[PDB]
RNA sequence: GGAUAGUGGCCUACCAUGGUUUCAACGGGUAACGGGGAAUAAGGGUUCGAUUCCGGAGAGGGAGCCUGAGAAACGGCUACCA
RNA sequence: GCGGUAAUUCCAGCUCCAAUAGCGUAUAUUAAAGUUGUUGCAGUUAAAAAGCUCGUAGUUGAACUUUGGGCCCGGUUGGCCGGUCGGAUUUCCAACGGGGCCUUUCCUUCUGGCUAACCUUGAGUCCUUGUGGCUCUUGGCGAACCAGGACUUUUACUUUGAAAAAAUUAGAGUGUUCAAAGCAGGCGUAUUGCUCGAAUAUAUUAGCAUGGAAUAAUAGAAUAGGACG
RNA sequence: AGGGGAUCGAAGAUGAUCAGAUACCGUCGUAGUCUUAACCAUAAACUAUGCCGACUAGGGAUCGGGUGGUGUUUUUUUAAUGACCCACUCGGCACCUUACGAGAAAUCAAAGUCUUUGGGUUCUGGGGGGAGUAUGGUCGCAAGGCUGAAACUUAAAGGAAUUG
């Protein structure tokens, strides 16, 4: 049974890109998926996306460009202690100058750079590059 | 995920499971079972001193043909009996029955050396002096 | 616990030094002392209204609450006038960077000013060693019955 | 997918987007609630009623023409059974399977099947029991099940 | 393939698909008003009846149940809505 | 890939698949670049002057070379119908 | 209630039947004093700490106790064992 | 792996190599070891999926409930000017953050004590044609927190901070002749004395105190024994 | 422990074969093979491939179910039926072709979406022997099942593929 609804949304996006597609249907969407989708978008890693309203949990159509190598999820949402943020980005980003660890914090779902700027931390959602 | 838990609360399962599986580590299990202290002719200690019971001529393994000079030694703190090799040319002439000798391991973590069957130790001293010195003739075997 | 009898001992039960002079014709028979335990724990009316003795009652007795103020949930009410609570907590194990459920049972005194039942969340205040195991006293019930009456008969 | 067998059958009602209307549907909440009742008065399960209302009448979904689910309507009018319908039909079935296993102590398949039905029963009782629709420590015993259902 | 409109699928290729695999789901069963000229009124049947729907007044029949779509009783007529 | 002070560094900025905007690297010797001729009034095809498209080896291997070119050239004006953005 | 410097099954009397446990009780092992710490350097870790500082315990083994503010003291006494 | 007669390997001579006041050997442990795998292993055939299904403990568990829009306030980098005798502040500017309002929006709640802040304004105005600007009391802001009452669903996570031994560790300062160290020392009238120090960081699980309200739990009103008065 | 006991047939006895032949082949044939009531709990019990969920690629057959047709065939008077044909769609047992992708390879629509390493969960392995042995526990009438060590020994054992 569906354990992470986010996990499906990322792996879907990932398989689209890999296969050269320019869009994906995803199912079933969530507040969290949207916000994660939103961060990637803000940073260019996908185009526009549309929420279609089945009278249920939602579907999403993402339009993706091809700037995307990987968008991954972090399966237990481990707590990060703001100083540990460095250790995550390093572990799992390609270089120190681009790419993002995106994570959930009391002050919103935000990438680590915004997290750094706002001086907050929390739990780790996933990543983009 | 194949096969380990990934959950945020599966820490206990993950420790236990490790503990359980460490017992497949040959070094780990000997450490905790206390094999050293229990079996093993030395205490678990680096050398041991014993007494020379008889001089053996151990025939070497294939593909090698030789007589490997050795000694049966009874460990002083132990009475455990052990056969040990007497390194270098001659040197068997430097020992004698009832002589005191200082045995050490063969650097092989237990386990026999090369073509010598059974032997896991080598002689380092006799009557308080050391082969090496006697061999290179910079010292002499003591009176009695 | 207590319930009934109140004078059910070999020794006459009384609050110490709370004299009621027989010569003086009073209309309540027994003069009763109580206190406000502090930290804003309301001394419940069952204590002031009460007639039970209990010298380990935080409100009518000779103990005091000072130190830790813990909450836990009731797991045994077999002991006369004392209970056991389970205190859950997740214990962090660094190497795996996750947690494991742990618990501790804790024995606490419970004043007959309270009617506790298995399932209730209860707030307890540390007091002086009250027995071999008990260092705690039920100070408020942050519960009730956990919906008991709402499983009754059929329509 | 499918809790007690290898089956992967995706298969259900595809309910309509339109949560109100049917616009060609006249009548009234008044009418079909009355309808819901007299049916359940004959001794009909809510499911049966939903079906019965779906075919002979126009009742697309009872919950749309009426504000409520069919079982809730029943409960309100004081018509709800001692235990929920689905638990009932599990117990009723386990009874019929057991009654057969008693007559056929050589039918290992039936033994196996009984276990499954009861394992589903006990898990469902555990649910209802959690949400107060069954008294705490309500329990299915086989020695007493035959009474429960007939 | 490689680039297409998931948001505006063609009605045909949407029509051939399974009811739960359309873009948003809906049924593909209909209702109908059904009459046998012996009587003067119109009962409303569901295209997949299961219950052998008996007419308003006359115990006649109307449709037997099947695997899916109910089979309507031989000498009759109907409209969809 | 600029540097410390504005200077362009790291030789060579690779082409991209007109279709997937992924890099077309050197050993990608299955990729393609189609030069399509600009033409003037009454036929005639204006030599040395093209509408041009590139196409990754990936895409052509996956057999998507023909559909993808269709869409590309058509939303430039060199095709008139043929390609449906719906299915 | 007694005893204690004093809380407390600490002990006694009466009364009750409780208390802990797969979230591992209870039992066994430890060539186990605990800690500050040591060694090994991508990180995560692994292994070690009798031993300069803090805490605890002991004075051949057990128990008892005198003096005294403070000891169940051993460069104090008493007894038994060795 | 060499040695059974021309031994690149033994016993030596010669010469050469490596580290050098030091170098070898034994035992243990650490790194290599992603061969214990949380990060991060492997299990068709190399070692390894229980014959099969049910199932308790345990781990895990779909989506949805204040979002959007408007207004003010004051911060810290950075630009372009520098006014000024290296750094300075206003306005032009973007950028990144904090707070507080109004949007249908408890902020625990009364009962006063307090008021710092403007819907105020009472006069007018230093002065750039004036909302640029602050002193200034007589109708009109709560919450900023005192303290007395009366009552509060329960957690995880994260933040900042308090409480915190030294030595060790990281690390600043200082020319123990260098250095390991040490916490000294450095200037003069070196005849009656002047003076810089003896930092900082880490210190985590738990407990304490504060801010956040995403993620994940908990509780709520359905035989109404519901909510406010 | 009863019944049954045609057949085939561990054991046994034979005829041949052979240097020998306790066998292969032939003959006789006990248990057994079948059934009831109870035991036993193991098989290369095999796909040598845990389960649930998602995604990633093409093709023609087939099993079940359903939908669509001024399709075919059955004649009667056209139908209704039925069997058949075409298109589609769920869910099966499989095959074909490819490989973006995986692997040490053989190969693999999973053995893919893994150093760009995290959906959930169960289980097992950690060089080869010693050995599924010893010992204790437990189950069994028994045979035996489950659980299951070490000392010591050893430089390979092993897998896939290539050429001979
Ligand atoms: Mg093993
Ligand atoms: Mg011998
Ligand atoms: Mg009791
Ligand atoms: Mg399914
Ligand atoms: Mg299951
Ligand atoms: Mg169905
Ligand atoms: Mg007592
Ligand atoms: Mg008892
Ligand atoms: Mg255990
Ligand atoms: Mg010790
Ligand atoms: Mg230790
Ligand atoms: Mg120590
Ligand atoms: Mg010691
Ligand atoms: Mg002492
Ligand atoms: Mg001594
Ligand atoms: Mg004794
Ligand atoms: Mg003493
Ligand atoms: Mg002394
Ligand atoms: Mg020679
Ligand atoms: Mg030579
Ligand atoms: Mg030489
Ligand atoms: Mg060295
Ligand atoms: Mg990790
Ligand atoms: Mg391995
Ligand atoms: Mg194998
Ligand atoms: Mg299997
Ligand atoms: Mg959820
Ligand atoms: Mg802190
Ligand atoms: Mg310090
Ligand atoms: Mg027979
Ligand atoms: Mg025979
Ligand atoms: Mg014969
Ligand atoms: Mg024989
Ligand atoms: Mg087996
Ligand atoms: Mg097979
Ligand atoms: Mg296919
Ligand atoms: Mg048909
Ligand atoms: Mg060899
Ligand atoms: Mg071959
Ligand atoms: Zn009719």
C abuts F (3+ Cβ pairs < 8 Å): no
Q: What span, in angstroms and rounded, lies between the C-alpha atoms of C109 and F50? A: 93
Q: What span, in angstroms and rounded, lies between the C-alpha atoms of D115 and A33? A: 41
Q: Could you please report the per-residue DSSP string of D46-106?
A: HHHHHHHHHHTS--S-HHHHSSS-HHHHHHHTT---SS-HHHHHHHHHHHHHHHHHHH-TT
Cβ of residue A120 lies below 7 Å from strand H:
yes
- Sign, CA dihedral C101-A31-D11-A3, equals negative
Q: Does B10 touch chain C (CB under 8 A)?
A: yes
Residue F35: other Cβ atoms inside 10 A: 11
Q: Would you say C99 and C65 are in contact if contact means Cβ atoms under 8 Å apart?
A: no
Q: How far is the CA of B12 from the centre of ligand 12 (A)?
A: 29
* Nucleotides in chain G with any atom closer than 7 Å to protein CB: 7-10, 14, 16-24, 31, 43-48
Q: How far is the CA of C100 from the C1' of H50 (A)?
A: 27
Q: Which candidate from A21, A52, A54 shows the least CB-CB separation from E2? A: A21
Q: C93 forms bridges with which residues in the sheet?
A: C98
**Maximum CA extent, chain A:** 43
Cβ neighbors of B103 (< 8 A, separation 6 or more) are B42, B47, B48, B49, B50, B73, B75, B82, B84, B121, B122, B123, B124
Cβ of residue D123 lies below 7 Å from strand H:
yes
Q: Does A20 touch chain F (CB under 8 A)?
A: yes
C47 closest CA partner among C143, C142, C139, C146: C139
Q: How many helices (H) and strands (E) does chain C have?
A: 1, 5
Residue given tokens 């027995």 in the structure block: C131
Are the Cβ atoms of A76 and B1 closer than 8 angstroms?
A: no
Q: Would you say D84 and D129 are in contact if contact means Cβ atoms under 8 Å apart?
A: no
Q: Would you say C96 and C110 are in contact if contact means Cβ atoms under 8 Å apart?
A: no
Give the chain E residue nearest D24 (alpha carbons). Answer: E81
Strand ranges in C20-144 using DSSP code E only, listed in sequence order: 69-76, 82-93, 98-109, 121-126, 136-141
Q: Does D19 touch chain A (CB under 8 A)?
A: yes
This structure was determined by: X-ray
Q: Which nucleotide's C1' sits nearest to the alpha carbon of B61?
A: I154
Which residues constitute the domain of residue F15? 1-87
Q: What span, in angstroms and rounded, lies between the C-alpha atoms of F77 and E12? A: 28
Burial class (CB in 10 A: 0-12, 13-18, 19+), C150: exposed
- Sign, CA dihedral C73-C78-C83-C84, equals negative
Cβ neighbors of B69 (< 8 A, separation 6 or more) are B55, B56, B57, B58, B85, B86, B91, B92
Q: Could you please report the per-residue DSSP string of chain E?
A: --S--SSS--HHHHHSS-TTSSSS------EEEEE-TTSSS-EEEETT-SS----SSS----EE--SSSPEE-SS-EEEE-
Q: What span, in angstroms and rounded, lies between the C-alpha atoms of A102 and A122? A: 11
Q: Which nucleotide's C1' sits nearest to the alpha carbon of D6?
A: I51
CATH code, domain with F70: 3.30.1230.20
Backbone angles phi, psi at C65, to 5 degrees: -100, 125
Q: What span, in angstroms and rounded, lies between the C-alpha atoms of B69 and B56? A: 6
- The C-alpha of C88 sits at a distance from chain B's nearest C-alpha, in angstroms, of 14
Around ion ligand 40, residues with a beta carbon closer than 5 Å are E 36, 39, 55, 58, 60
Q: Would you say A78 and B6 are in contact if contact means Cβ atoms under 8 Å apart?
A: no
Are the Cβ atoms of F20 and A66 closer than 8 angstroms?
A: yes
Cβ neighbors of E38 (< 8 A, separation 6 or more) are E58, E60
* Annotated resolution, angstroms: 2.8
Cβ neighbors of C113 (< 8 A, separation 6 or more) are C43, C44, C46, C47, C50, C52, C57, C59, C60
Enclosing H/E stretch for B65:
none
A12 closest CA partner among A49, A53, A44: A49
């Amino acid at each position: 049974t569906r354990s992470s609804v986010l996990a499906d949304a990322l792996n879907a996006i990932n398989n689209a890109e890999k296969t050269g597609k320019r869009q994906v249907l995803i199912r079933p969407s969530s507040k969290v998926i949207i916000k994660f989708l939103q961060v990637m978008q803000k940073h260019g890693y996908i185009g526009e996306f549309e929420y279609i309203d089945d009278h249920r949990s939602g579907k999403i159509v993402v339009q993706l460009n091809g700037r995307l190598n990987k968008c991954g999820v972090i399966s237990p949402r481990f707590n990060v202690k703001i100083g540990d943020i460095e250790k995550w980005t390093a572990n799992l980003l390609p270089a120190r100058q681009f790419g993002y660890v995106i994570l959930t914090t009391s002050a919103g779902i935000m990438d680590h750079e915004e997290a750094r700027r706002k001086h907050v931390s929390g739990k780790i959602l996933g990543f983009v590059y | 995920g194949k096969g380990k838990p990934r959950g945020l609360n599966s820490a206990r399962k993950l420790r236990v499971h490790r503990r359980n599986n460490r017992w497949a580590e040959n070094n780990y299990k000997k450490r905790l079972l206390g094999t050293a202290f229990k079996s093993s002719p030395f205490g678990g200690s680096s050398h041991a001193k014993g007494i020379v019971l008889e001089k053996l001529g151990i025939e070497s393994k294939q593909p090698n043909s030789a007589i490997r000079k050795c000694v049966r030694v009874q460990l002083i703190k132990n009475g455990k009996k052990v056969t040990a090799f007497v390194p270098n040319d001659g040197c068997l002439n430097f020992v004698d029955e009832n002589d005191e000798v200082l045995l050490a391991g063969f650097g092989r973590k237990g386990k026999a050396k090369g073509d010598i069957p059974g032997v896991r130790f080598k002689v380092v001293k006799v009557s308080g002096v050391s082969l090496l010195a006697l061999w290179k003739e910079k010292k002499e075997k003591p009176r009695s | 616990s207590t319930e009934l009898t109140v004078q059910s001992e070999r020794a006459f039960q009384k609050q110490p030094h709370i004299f009621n002079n027989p010569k003086v014709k009073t209309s309540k028979r027994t003069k009763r002392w109580y206190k406000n335990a502090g930290l804003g724990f309301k001394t419940p009316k069952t204590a002031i209204e009460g007639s039970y003795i209990d010298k380990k009652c935080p409100f009518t007795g000779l103990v005091s609450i000072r130190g830790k103020i813990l909450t836990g949930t009731v797991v045994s009410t077999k002991m006369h006038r004392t209970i056991v609570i389970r205190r859950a907590y997740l214990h962090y194990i660094p190497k795996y960077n996750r947690y494991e459920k742990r618990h501790k049972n804790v024995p606490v005194h419970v004043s007959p000013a309270f009617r506790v039942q298995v399932g209730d969340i209860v707030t307890v205040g540390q007091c002086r060693p009250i027995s071999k195991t008990v260092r705690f006293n039920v100070v408020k019930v942050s519960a009730a019955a956990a919906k008991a009456n709402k499983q009754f008969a059929k329509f | 997918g499918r809790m007690h067998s290898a089956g992967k059958g995706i298969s259900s009602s595809a309910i309509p987007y339109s949560r109100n209307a049917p616009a060609w549907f006249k009548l009234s909440s008044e009418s079909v609630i009355e309808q819901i009742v007299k049916y359940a008065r004959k001794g009909l399960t809510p499911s049966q009623i939903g079906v019965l209302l779906r075919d002979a009448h126009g009742v697309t979904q009872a919950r749309v023409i009426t504000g409520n689910k069919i079982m809730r309507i029943l409960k309100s009018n004081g018509l709800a059974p001692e235990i929920p319908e689905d638990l009932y039909y599990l117990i009723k079935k386990a009874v019929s399977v057991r009654k057969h296993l008693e007559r056929n102590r050589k039918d290992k398949d039936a033994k196996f099947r009984l276990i499954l039905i009861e394992s589903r029963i006990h898990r469902l009782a555990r649910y209802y029991r959690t949400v107060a629709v069954l008294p705490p420590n309500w329990k299915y015993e086989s020695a007493t099940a035959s009474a429960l259902v007939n | 393939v490689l680039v297409q409109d998931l948001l505006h699928p063609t009605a045909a290729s949407e029509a051939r698909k399974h009811k739960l695999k359309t873009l948003v789901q809906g049924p593909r069963s209909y209702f109908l008003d059904v009459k046998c000229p012996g009587c003067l009124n119109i009962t409303t049947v569901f295209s997949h009846a299961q219950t052998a729907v008996t007419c308003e007044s006359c115990s006649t029949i109307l449709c037997t149940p099947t695997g899916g779509k109910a089979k309507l009783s031989e000498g009759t007529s109907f409209r969809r809505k | 890939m600029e540097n410390d002070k504005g200077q362009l560094v790291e030789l060579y900025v690779p082409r991209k698949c007109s279709a997937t905007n992924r890099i077309i690297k050197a050993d990608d010797h299955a990729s393609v670049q189609i030069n399509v001729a600009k033409v003037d009034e009454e036929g005639r095809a204006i030599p040395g002057e093209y509408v041009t498209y590139a196409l990754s080896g990936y895409v052509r291997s996956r057999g998507e070379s023909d559909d993808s070119l269709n869409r590309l050239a058509q939303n430039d004006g060199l095709l008139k119908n043929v390609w449906s953005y719906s299915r």
